[PDB]
């Protein structure tokens, strides 16, 4: 009569990173700056070390702000616009190599493999 | 000639929640401690305000500690797998109805409507 429930709800990723995405627009939550050229992107620490063995690396240790050489702020940009949803969306093809580049370096797997 | 790229990587979300459920095992990037009964549950405030609309209201004012009253700590740690995972996994029967009461209480539409 003991009885063992499962269940899985499938729609609960795509709802959980469009809030964390949301919550990024304002800065909610957020506990690094991360700079990258003239541009200050605001993030959650969790997110970034779960998704770039880079920052996983770099946050074991690191303060609140910390910055990026080698990659143009718009790369950086799109970076964070998958690692806030899973998904790239019309990329332009001249960026892709570059995009590609900033995913190796920051091991972030899928970027990193798109070539 | 200007091609815009798109793709969507399915796997992310799986593997996203996998770190972040390891993050919170260790504490890591923990910024909020959930007392329930005589239970301290590390978290981040980041998921939870995401996942649940209870600590959505709740923390967009709180401290590091807050606490939760009429949820049993073991039905508050399978709402946090839950919340770090997108699955409950062999919930005892006789613990569902406490369950589904908790994402009640919590907000989380999901648990909330198991039943």
Chains 1, 2 share one sequence.
Not at 35 to 58: C, G
Request: charged content about 20%.
């Amino acid at each position: 009569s003991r009885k063992l429930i499962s269940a899985t709800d499938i729609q609960y990723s795509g709802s959980l990173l469009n809030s964390l995405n949301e919550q990024r627009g304002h800065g909610l939550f957020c506990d690094v700056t991360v700079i990258v050229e003239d541009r200050k992107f605001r993030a959650h620490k969790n997110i970034l070390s779960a998704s770039s063995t880079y920052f996983h690396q770099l946050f074991s240790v690191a303060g609140q702000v910390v910055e990026l050489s080698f990659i143009r702020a718009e790369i950086f940009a799109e970076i964070l616009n998958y690692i806030y949803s899973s998904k790239i969306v019309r990329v332009r093809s001249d960026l892709l190599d570059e995009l590609i580049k900033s995913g190796q370096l920051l091991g972030v797997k899928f970027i990193a493999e798109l070539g």
